[PDB]
From a paper:
The long-wavelength beamline I23 at Diamond Light Source overcomes these limitations and extends the accessible wavelength range to λ = 5.9 Å. Native-SAD uses light atoms naturally occurring in proteins or bound to proteins. We demonstrate that long-wavelength native-SAD has become a very compelling technique, where a low multiplicity dataset from a single crystal can be sufficient for successful structure determination, making it a general vehicle of choice for experimental phasing.
To confirm the benefit of collecting at long wavelengths, we collected from [name]-[name] crystals on beamline I23. A single dataset of 360° from a crystal diffracting to 1.8 Å was sufficient not only to solve the substructure but also to solve the structure without any phase extension, despite the low symmetry space group (C2), low overall completeness (65%) and the 27-fold lower multiplicity of only 6. This case clearly shows that data collection at longer wavelengths requires substantially reduced overall multiplicity. Solving a structure from a single crystal with low multiplicity is advantageous for multiple reasons: the number of crystals might be limited; crystals may not be isomorphous and cannot be merged or they may be especially susceptible to radiation damage.
Numbering used by the authors: 388 to 539
The structure:
């Protein structure tokens, strides 16, 4: 797990490495079983949700380094009637803080909601690994959209 001291980011901030990829060019010829097989070459797929209504999907890898390998390999892949285009997505924190070129957010701690703070510290994958949020640390995207809890 990434819990790095990053004392050269701005004051009162954290740095979050996305594990979430945006998938563009998802026509109805591009199906979840085939994409899962393509991305499982790079590591374990935590989540993969296509929405053919928007010609897009979102993939979350268990590991940042597998998301990096996937994004570079799958950046532009001709496929059937389309081209699959893999770009950095954001699954955590303010979208406005997410560098869409690199999948790296630098977030002022004051902009983290209570849910965001609780997900960071309690996530199974990414986050702090059970330590408090302090400024000048770099970590991986936490798991989100779960109950606020420390018992379960």
């Amino acid at each position: 797990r990434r819990f790095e001291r990053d004392p050269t980011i701005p004051p009162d901030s954290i740095k979050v490495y996305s594990r979430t990829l945006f998938l563009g060019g998802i026509t109805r010829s591009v199906r979840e079983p085939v994409l899962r097989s393509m991305f499982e070459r790079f590591g374990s797929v935590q989540s993969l949700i296509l929405n053919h209504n928007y010609r897009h999907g979102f993939l979350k890898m268990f590991r940042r380094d597998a998301a990096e390998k996937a994004q570079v390999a799958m950046e532009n892949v001709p496929f059937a009637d389309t081209t699959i285009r893999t770009k950095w997505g954001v699954g955590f924190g303010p979208r406005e803080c997410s560098d869409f070129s690199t999948g790296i957010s630098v977030i002022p701690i004051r902009l983290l909601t209570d849910a965001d703070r609780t997900w960071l510290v309690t996530a199974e994958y990414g986050g702090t690994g059970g330590l408090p949020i302090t400024p000048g640390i770099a970590l991986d995207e936490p798991d989100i959209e779960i109950g606020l809890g420390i018992s379960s």
